[PDB]
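User: For a benchmark we're assembling, each entry needs the component sequences followed by a predicted structure for the full assembly. Here are entry 17's components. Please fill in the structure.
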Amino acid sequence: SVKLKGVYKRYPGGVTAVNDFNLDIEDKEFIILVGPSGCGKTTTLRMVAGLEEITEGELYIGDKLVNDVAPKDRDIAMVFQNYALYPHMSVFDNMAFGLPKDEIKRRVLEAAKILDIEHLLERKPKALSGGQRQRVALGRAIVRNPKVFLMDEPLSNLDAKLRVQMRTEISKLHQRLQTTFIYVTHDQTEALTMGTRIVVMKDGYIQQVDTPTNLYERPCNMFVAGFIGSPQMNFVNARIEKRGDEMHLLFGKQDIKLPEGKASEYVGREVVMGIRPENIRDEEIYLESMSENVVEGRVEVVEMLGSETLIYMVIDDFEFTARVNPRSKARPGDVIKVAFDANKIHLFDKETEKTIM
Amino acid sequence: SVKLKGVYKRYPGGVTAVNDFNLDIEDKEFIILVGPSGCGKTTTLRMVAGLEEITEGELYIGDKLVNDVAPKDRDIAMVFQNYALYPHMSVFDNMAFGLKLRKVPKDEIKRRVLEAAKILDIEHLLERKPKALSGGQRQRVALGRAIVRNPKVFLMDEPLSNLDAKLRVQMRTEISKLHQRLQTTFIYVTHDQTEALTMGTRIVVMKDGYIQQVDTPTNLYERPCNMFVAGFIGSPQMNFVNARIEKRGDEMHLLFGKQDIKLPEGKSSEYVGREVVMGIRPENIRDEEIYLESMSENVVEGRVEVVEMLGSETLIYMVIDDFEFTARVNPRSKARPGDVIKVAFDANKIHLFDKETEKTIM
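Assistant: Structure for entry 17:
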């Protein structure tokens, strides 16, 4: 367990890098820190590790306050992008720096075969490059059985398909040792599967802390909504209008009827509507059931992937991206009848940019 | 335009590698040859290129028979795994070769080489040598020696095999953009299936030497002619179970295990009562509550065992009775291992094959 109570970090010149970071990681938890560059996500990790000092706040590991504890005295394994293995040491010895009980150390180190480095086991760092030397750094930390793991983009020099293989082995390791993990990555796509809870940070402030599913389906503001999930969620200005007992959203000359179950102090007001691509669907089941919420749009580019078909269109004056089932019939220039799934509409304040529900 | 009329190739020992290969490529067309290893796809290219002889049949590039024409007199551009760039020549000279001894247009060779370089954004590499380049750049350079040929056909034998995951996709879309630019016939051979759905005008699926099907990407995907095309194109693989067709009233139902799926009015005779193989793709086993209300008749309970969230999709792996099935649904599903899920089978997208003959009934 690690707790950060009201933690600040200020840079030279008074600039605030991390602003009131409060969060309680329970033990045996996988927490992911995502956010744009300079959002303070990397800074907090260096502070939990003890590489930067904590200007203000408290940091506890278990029960012990460690703000002024040297990194070596925290029982933490760290992998950062300065992994920097020693050039004139074998792969084994470069992973065997756990001070120790030799001849069992080897067993655990050979078990690092999970990283597919067993065929490099007696090599030296210069013969590997890019991805392989980063998997060596991982290995070093992998055999440490610490109280918490701290990882800063440890799979960034690897290629797609091998990064995926090592992400599943990190998750299995957390499932096996059940020690706290704090994982930092630029990629968002690796947050949604790995972490128990995800923390979205922006310009030093944490926007939201929730489970991957909850971040995806209940964002707190337009930023989190437009930061998690790709391609970016579609955004339009819309006016809420009550017609009869129905509640409608109007943007351009188009008309979306919200389902009975939505709402008070925003009726007649103009809001921003948010729908994700996979909720603009063209299969005709939806075009008959959600007939009230079908809109005609002029397709401009289509992209077929085998997993999906992404359709980029323009409705009245606004560009929209849609995700439909693989191998679609749409082509650039035609106008297609898309249905907006009102049950998946997000509504934010135009000024505060936070959600109304 | 390229035509291959009844073309065969047999190996030492009498084994036939290519068996009655027939198809007429229209000019300015992108054709893809896909199939398992040793399906003869590489052999066919080697025969179009002139590197192997044609045992029987007729090859016509343009309007002329070229079975006995040397490759170099065939007006062919080739990017194969043979095309090692010349080690001690600049990429420029490596792109100006062939053109340099096909009746040198010295001035008109610089102009064309640099237009092919500007298309591939390799002009800032014109003075580097192949050993200084990396795999991806030399695959762009190798392509470049072919744009300067202005050929009648381009021949590509797995030219994106030496690349890593992301790079591949980047140079495929560049080829699709490239064919859309030169508007010359392309014949492309690749191992990966995913570009059935991405690259080609028409696709040829080959199996054990035979052409299984020649069709457009959508039609290849949506109307496979046999279980092989059905299970070779599309990922994850299409689900297959043995089922028996049964006529109850004028409805027609399909039964496998304890479950019963009713086909819509429009599916007919001379296969009813017999055991068939059913084929449905994962994106047609789907759990959205829209499906369970319209297609309540064809809702099935299945025990989830593994789920994989990808951001683009959610893959759900389930067992029904003794049978296994996979479904592809929206990115963040709530189904988790141990639960039982209520999936709807989209009857309008079920494929039915002969159990013995293994070819499609419709």
